[PDB]
Amino acid sequence: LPSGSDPAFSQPKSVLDAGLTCQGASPSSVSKPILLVPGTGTTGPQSFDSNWIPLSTQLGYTPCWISPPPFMLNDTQVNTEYMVNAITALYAGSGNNKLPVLTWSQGGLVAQWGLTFFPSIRSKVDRLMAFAPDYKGTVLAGPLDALAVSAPSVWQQTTGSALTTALRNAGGLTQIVPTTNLYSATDEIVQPQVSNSPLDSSYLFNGKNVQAQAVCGPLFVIDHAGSLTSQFSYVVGRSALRSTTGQARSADYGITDCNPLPANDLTPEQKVAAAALLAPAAAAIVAGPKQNCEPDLMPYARPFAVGKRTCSGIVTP
Amino acid sequence: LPSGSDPAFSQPKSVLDAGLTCQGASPSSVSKPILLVPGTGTTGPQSFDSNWIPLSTQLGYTPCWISPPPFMLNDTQVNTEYMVNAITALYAGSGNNKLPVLTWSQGGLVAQWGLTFFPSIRSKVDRLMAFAPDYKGTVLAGPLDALAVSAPSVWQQTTGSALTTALRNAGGLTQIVPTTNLYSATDEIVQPQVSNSPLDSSYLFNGKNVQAQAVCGPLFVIDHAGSLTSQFSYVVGRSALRSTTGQARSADYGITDCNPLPANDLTPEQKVAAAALLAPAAAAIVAGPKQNCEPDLMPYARPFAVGKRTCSGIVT
Ligand SMILES: *[C@@H]1O[C@H](CO)[C@@H](O[C@@H]2O[C@H](CO)[C@@H](O)[C@H](O)[C@H]2NC(C)=O)[C@H](O)[C@H]1NC(C)=O
Ligand SMILES: *[C@@H]1O[C@H](CO)[C@@H](O[C@@H]2O[C@H](CO)[C@@H](O)[C@H](O)[C@H]2NC(C)=O)[C@H](O)[C@H]1NC(C)=O
Ligand SMILES: [Xe]
Ligand SMILES: [Xe]
Ligand SMILES: [Xe]
Ligand SMILES: [Xe]
Ligand SMILES: [Xe]
Ligand SMILES: [Xe]
């Protein structure tokens, strides 16, 4: 696990600040911030408007989010600069108090990538609550890569990629702060997830790894979006947020919570938007950047993926 | 469309017979057979054990398959001989009743090649259910081979080949029996497939052409193998086999069936094997025989590709 200096940002602070927003507040002065990190092909509001923005508010946080241009389709390493900058600002802006980080899809990857390579945030992040995170990426991105219709971060989120290799070799498949991972074997975007074991993309060693089917039964179905927005998700996320261990507790949820539909506390109109979460992401990925190779690893990550091939060639020792 | 007698087999009949196997039945006596034609780099069981062998069985058919050696990598015209022979056999052993044929990848091209050039089997094939068929071949060279160092059948499935030229010119890009073509814009082996229109390699004129994304939206992702194994592929497949017209019906599938993962009815172990269908197939292509030219068309196909080049040279 790297433990020296933070790598320098490739983006100016003014650029990284322009991608952070809080609801009803400036980040330099905010009460109880929760930082929300969005999925692939979405902004913060598109990922979280219909769910964790109002649900975290009702739990007493001030929701904050990053929206890395364009819609999280660019380099994951740069997306992480937005998060590291945001954590740093929210920590100070909230009286030097640690803050929770809550994520979906790529956002979990971005968060764990942050914790792995930017040691400074380790003492500023209270816990991690990750919904459907792809630490090992997904095999399903593969045919998109072969067709050269994959955005930079879609390449990076493909199993076997230089980036996911780098994360693994640096020790990032072990939790770095108290982490809860909620995911589903029936996730139609992120696979493999079927094992309820270290083989799963969403699994971290020593983490609170919650496969929906382990709680709700092997026949239970919940998809990629519902991993974030469901009633079941809410009860788990609330468990993780309220817990004094920093992880969700088994005693906090059970069979009566196993409802994959949008969380009960959402208004009917929010439920409609939540169910259709992936629609804006579909249009963004279709109109988004596409290339025929994986983006190069930043210098700090290269020693951990020697032999992998990116846009510029083989990563050398 | 070619009209006369069937062209003579280049292979002994007994060799072709041994390439046919039915699950639990002699070909001489089988109820409700369905013939499975496999993709490049596979045997019948390798293409279908994790999917349409058990899925057709639960639908009430007896699955039968052909396995032309070596792993469908040889001449597509010889691959076709196995299928023609198999159909003739299964038709008689089911009481002279027509039988459905269901195919993956090269399987569809083989099927349509047979229907185009072997007229005897037209009265014997009830319907064709082709998943990701490459009737136009593919424009994708791919990463498996050095360019123009490839298996016989890989040459033949390259867009612009003498064999795809011959198929088009013979009239074989029109459906010959009631045909359903299920395919995907996100097929990484066969392209073009993205337009939902006669531009796609899987499209047959008058056929029931089902491009998955046309029903499931642009980010519904199933690959060349997902085209065969997914829940949506199952639903469309089931419709085509049940339909009283021999083609899948739009009424039997819609948005709610849009699940890219392997068909629900498959066991957990089948789902794993089906999701992994491609890797060994690609490996047999990499590891297979290789040559620097497209095999020659048989005499029966040469008039339909005059000017194309093959191993012996230009077609006269
Ligand atoms: C998208 O990611 C690329 C690649 O990481 C970024 O390009 C780098 O940008 C920094 C600052 O402009 C430069 O100093 C680097 O030299 C660039 N590297 C390459 C390989 O291009 C780009 O800034 C990102 N774009 C957005 C909008 O975030
Ligand atoms: C692979 O295909 C080739 C070419 O179609 C087959 O070779 C022909 O076989 C017939 C019958 O033995 C001969 O009359 C021809 O002279 C052969 N032509 C050539 C170019 O070799 C071959 O039999 C096939 N191999 C297998 C194992 O199916
Ligand atoms: Xe996505
Ligand atoms: Xe984080
Ligand atoms: Xe994607
Ligand atoms: Xe999506
Ligand atoms: Xe056929
Ligand atoms: Xe060719």
XYZ file of C-alpha atoms in Angstrom, chain B:
316
model
C -31.991 -19.429 -56.800
C -30.148 -22.621 -57.915
C -32.733 -25.258 -58.955
C -31.502 -28.728 -59.993
C -30.156 -31.754 -58.203
C -27.965 -31.518 -55.118
C -24.256 -31.243 -55.910
C -22.407 -34.485 -55.096
C -20.724 -34.754 -51.710
C -16.967 -34.461 -51.673
C -16.875 -36.530 -48.383
C -17.883 -40.189 -47.932
C -21.441 -40.516 -46.579
C -20.143 -42.584 -43.610
C -17.768 -39.744 -42.591
C -20.697 -37.278 -42.662
C -22.940 -39.632 -40.632
C -20.292 -39.913 -37.906
C -20.318 -36.084 -37.583
C -24.003 -36.233 -36.510
C -25.128 -36.984 -32.913
C -28.557 -36.725 -31.270
C -29.008 -36.511 -27.513
C -30.667 -39.825 -26.503
C -31.857 -40.820 -30.005
C -30.748 -42.508 -33.191
C -31.132 -40.194 -36.227
C -33.135 -43.120 -37.721
C -35.775 -42.727 -34.998
C -36.152 -39.398 -33.266
C -39.148 -37.372 -32.255
C -39.088 -33.558 -32.624
C -35.473 -33.251 -33.721
C -33.817 -29.842 -33.898
C -30.496 -29.563 -35.761
C -27.792 -27.416 -34.144
C -25.091 -25.956 -36.444
C -22.042 -24.666 -34.432
C -19.720 -21.660 -34.819
C -16.086 -21.428 -35.963
C -13.537 -23.019 -33.589
C -16.146 -25.303 -31.881
C -17.809 -28.684 -31.992
C -21.606 -28.936 -31.593
C -21.373 -29.646 -27.790
C -18.827 -26.804 -27.336
C -21.178 -24.264 -28.988
C -24.381 -25.527 -27.429
C -23.885 -27.641 -24.185
C -24.226 -24.530 -22.022
C -27.294 -23.141 -23.832
C -29.394 -24.483 -26.696
C -28.829 -28.165 -26.058
C -30.524 -27.893 -22.612
C -32.838 -25.036 -23.677
C -34.195 -26.894 -26.727
C -34.616 -30.048 -24.544
C -36.870 -28.182 -22.067
C -38.877 -26.929 -25.061
C -39.554 -30.538 -25.946
C -37.155 -31.050 -28.867
C -34.470 -33.708 -29.275
C -31.270 -31.672 -29.845
C -29.008 -32.992 -32.615
C -25.721 -31.419 -33.740
C -22.971 -31.764 -36.310
C -19.286 -31.387 -35.561
C -17.327 -30.979 -38.857
C -13.593 -31.458 -38.255
C -11.490 -29.687 -37.244
C -13.706 -27.377 -35.116
C -15.526 -25.835 -38.133
C -12.160 -24.395 -39.249
C -12.207 -26.250 -42.618
C -13.994 -25.261 -45.863
C -17.496 -23.946 -45.238
C -18.675 -25.821 -48.352
C -17.603 -29.094 -46.746
C -19.112 -27.982 -43.425
C -22.356 -27.577 -45.351
C -22.178 -31.254 -46.523
C -22.417 -32.382 -42.918
C -25.560 -30.295 -42.381
C -27.266 -31.357 -45.668
C -26.622 -34.997 -44.828
C -27.833 -34.438 -41.236
C -31.102 -32.843 -42.400
C -31.805 -35.621 -44.895
C -31.199 -38.161 -42.062
C -33.319 -36.381 -39.395
C -36.177 -35.714 -41.764
C -36.555 -39.419 -42.538
C -36.059 -40.520 -38.915
C -38.810 -38.186 -37.738
C -41.323 -39.702 -40.201
C -40.621 -37.367 -43.154
C -41.447 -34.295 -41.074
C -39.663 -30.961 -41.533
C -37.365 -29.977 -38.737
C -36.213 -26.641 -37.282
C -32.549 -25.672 -37.625
C -30.831 -23.424 -35.085
C -27.367 -21.973 -35.597
C -24.580 -19.880 -34.113
C -22.220 -17.598 -36.090
C -20.735 -19.585 -39.075
C -23.570 -22.079 -38.499
C -26.021 -19.575 -40.103
C -23.857 -19.056 -43.180
C -23.505 -22.853 -43.517
C -27.289 -23.259 -43.199
C -28.056 -20.644 -45.822
C -25.304 -21.938 -48.080
C -27.003 -25.377 -47.927
C -30.490 -23.981 -48.569
C -29.148 -21.979 -51.489
C -27.192 -24.734 -53.253
C -28.766 -28.026 -52.106
C -32.403 -27.694 -53.156
C -33.449 -31.137 -51.780
C -33.458 -29.940 -48.140
C -35.778 -26.956 -48.748
C -38.833 -29.197 -48.277
C -37.196 -30.582 -45.086
C -36.318 -27.503 -43.061
C -39.329 -26.198 -41.117
C -37.584 -22.945 -40.088
C -34.158 -21.363 -39.445
C -33.244 -19.740 -36.099
C -29.841 -18.114 -36.677
C -28.032 -16.294 -33.835
C -25.432 -13.744 -34.981
C -25.221 -15.282 -38.514
C -22.548 -13.770 -40.818
C -24.143 -14.026 -44.325
C -22.144 -11.030 -45.545
C -19.115 -12.279 -43.558
C -17.250 -9.778 -41.345
C -15.173 -6.641 -42.121
C -13.285 -7.177 -38.877
C -9.847 -8.742 -39.388
C -9.662 -9.098 -35.589
C -6.616 -9.671 -33.327
C -6.448 -13.489 -33.558
C -4.506 -13.764 -36.782
C -1.865 -11.943 -38.712
C -3.822 -10.520 -41.667
C -4.305 -13.165 -44.451
C -2.821 -16.020 -42.349
C -6.042 -17.799 -41.367
C -8.088 -21.003 -41.338
C -10.032 -22.024 -44.532
C -13.424 -20.999 -43.132
C -12.007 -17.779 -41.634
C -10.949 -16.686 -45.180
C -14.467 -17.550 -46.396
C -16.215 -15.469 -43.695
C -14.075 -12.384 -44.556
C -16.307 -9.770 -46.225
C -15.437 -9.656 -49.944
C -14.550 -13.391 -50.034
C -15.413 -15.482 -53.098
C -17.791 -17.547 -50.903
C -19.876 -14.560 -49.615
C -19.831 -13.110 -53.157
C -21.187 -16.436 -54.469
C -23.930 -16.577 -51.834
C -25.188 -13.054 -52.596
C -25.090 -13.627 -56.450
C -26.954 -16.933 -56.162
C -29.830 -15.104 -54.365
C -29.073 -16.573 -50.904
C -29.395 -13.223 -49.049
C -33.128 -13.670 -49.357
C -34.769 -16.112 -46.869
C -35.483 -19.500 -48.413
C -37.439 -20.999 -45.467
C -39.118 -19.020 -42.605
C -36.028 -17.517 -40.928
C -35.357 -15.533 -37.737
C -32.036 -13.704 -37.312
C -31.178 -12.549 -33.798
C -28.168 -10.245 -33.626
C -26.464 -7.314 -31.844
C -24.863 -3.955 -32.736
C -22.216 -4.787 -30.138
C -21.040 -7.968 -31.885
C -17.249 -7.747 -31.731
C -16.667 -10.640 -34.230
C -19.195 -9.795 -36.962
C -19.675 -6.329 -38.400
C -21.385 -4.282 -39.751
C -24.377 -5.066 -37.517
C -25.223 -1.575 -36.147
C -27.823 -0.154 -38.571
C -30.873 -2.477 -37.952
C -31.275 -2.690 -41.735
C -30.176 -4.652 -44.826
C -26.657 -3.250 -44.307
C -26.113 -5.749 -41.407
C -24.330 -9.040 -41.997
C -27.117 -10.961 -40.219
C -30.005 -9.523 -42.283
C -32.060 -11.690 -44.697
C -34.591 -10.166 -47.112
C -38.168 -11.172 -46.023
C -36.577 -12.678 -42.889
C -37.533 -11.803 -39.350
C -34.494 -9.695 -38.456
C -34.157 -8.889 -34.819
C -31.346 -6.536 -33.863
C -31.338 -6.622 -30.063
C -30.698 -2.852 -29.577
C -33.743 -1.970 -31.698
C -35.836 -3.484 -28.864
C -33.529 -3.033 -25.878
C -31.955 0.379 -26.522
C -28.419 1.454 -27.504
C -26.664 0.320 -24.339
C -28.056 -3.164 -24.276
C -24.784 -5.035 -24.638
C -24.588 -8.615 -25.807
C -21.478 -9.805 -27.655
C -21.074 -12.356 -30.478
C -21.538 -15.184 -27.890
C -24.194 -13.257 -25.861
C -26.177 -13.143 -29.105
C -26.547 -16.904 -28.630
C -26.815 -17.322 -24.816
C -28.635 -14.313 -23.283
C -32.069 -14.234 -21.738
C -33.288 -11.972 -24.524
C -31.817 -14.412 -27.113
C -33.751 -17.205 -25.385
C -37.034 -15.332 -25.456
C -36.687 -14.561 -29.151
C -35.509 -18.142 -29.844
C -38.515 -19.617 -28.014
C -40.904 -17.401 -29.954
C -39.469 -18.590 -33.302
C -39.720 -22.241 -32.411
C -43.327 -21.882 -31.151
C -44.572 -19.500 -33.873
C -47.079 -20.955 -36.320
C -45.456 -18.878 -39.056
C -41.873 -20.223 -38.481
C -40.663 -16.666 -37.632
C -40.420 -15.053 -34.155
C -43.345 -12.682 -33.413
C -42.908 -9.122 -32.064
C -45.846 -9.861 -29.764
C -43.748 -12.426 -27.794
C -40.854 -10.186 -26.793
C -40.294 -6.616 -25.592
C -38.345 -4.333 -23.209
C -38.989 -6.480 -20.071
C -37.110 -9.408 -21.682
C -33.985 -7.210 -22.043
C -31.482 -9.139 -19.948
C -27.927 -9.529 -21.409
C -26.810 -12.226 -18.931
C -27.163 -15.954 -19.828
C -30.741 -17.332 -20.067
C -32.540 -17.605 -16.699
C -33.444 -21.265 -17.249
C -29.779 -22.272 -17.259
C -28.260 -23.741 -14.127
C -25.618 -21.657 -12.298
C -22.965 -23.908 -13.851
C -24.433 -23.615 -17.359
C -24.585 -19.765 -16.957
C -20.810 -19.739 -16.159
C -20.007 -22.043 -19.115
C -22.247 -19.957 -21.475
C -20.675 -16.654 -20.396
C -17.290 -18.221 -21.269
C -18.341 -19.572 -24.714
C -15.989 -17.423 -26.830
C -12.473 -17.824 -25.277
C -11.908 -21.523 -26.218
C -13.487 -20.966 -29.678
C -11.069 -18.094 -30.345
C -8.208 -20.288 -29.070
C -8.952 -23.051 -31.636
C -8.941 -20.366 -34.356
C -5.521 -19.134 -33.157
C -4.216 -22.703 -32.816
C -5.810 -24.079 -36.035
C -4.535 -24.696 -39.626
C -3.590 -21.576 -41.599
C -3.166 -20.671 -45.255
C -2.493 -17.593 -47.375
C -5.599 -17.871 -49.633
C -9.311 -18.502 -49.660
C -10.265 -22.118 -50.543
C -11.607 -22.603 -54.102
C -15.308 -22.579 -54.686
C -16.765 -25.901 -55.685
C -17.919 -26.159 -59.348
C -21.536 -25.478 -58.327
C -20.682 -22.057 -56.827
C -18.106 -20.715 -59.391
C -20.558 -19.074 -61.804
C -21.687 -16.718 -58.981
C -18.281 -15.267 -58.075
C -16.567 -14.740 -61.437
C -13.704 -12.282 -60.989
C -12.958 -13.103 -57.319
C -9.622 -14.734 -56.378
C -9.068 -17.963 -54.521
C -6.130 -20.400 -54.000
C -5.982 -21.555 -57.641
C -6.443 -17.921 -58.722
C -9.263 -15.948 -60.333
C -12.687 -17.515 -60.998
C -13.414 -17.931 -64.706
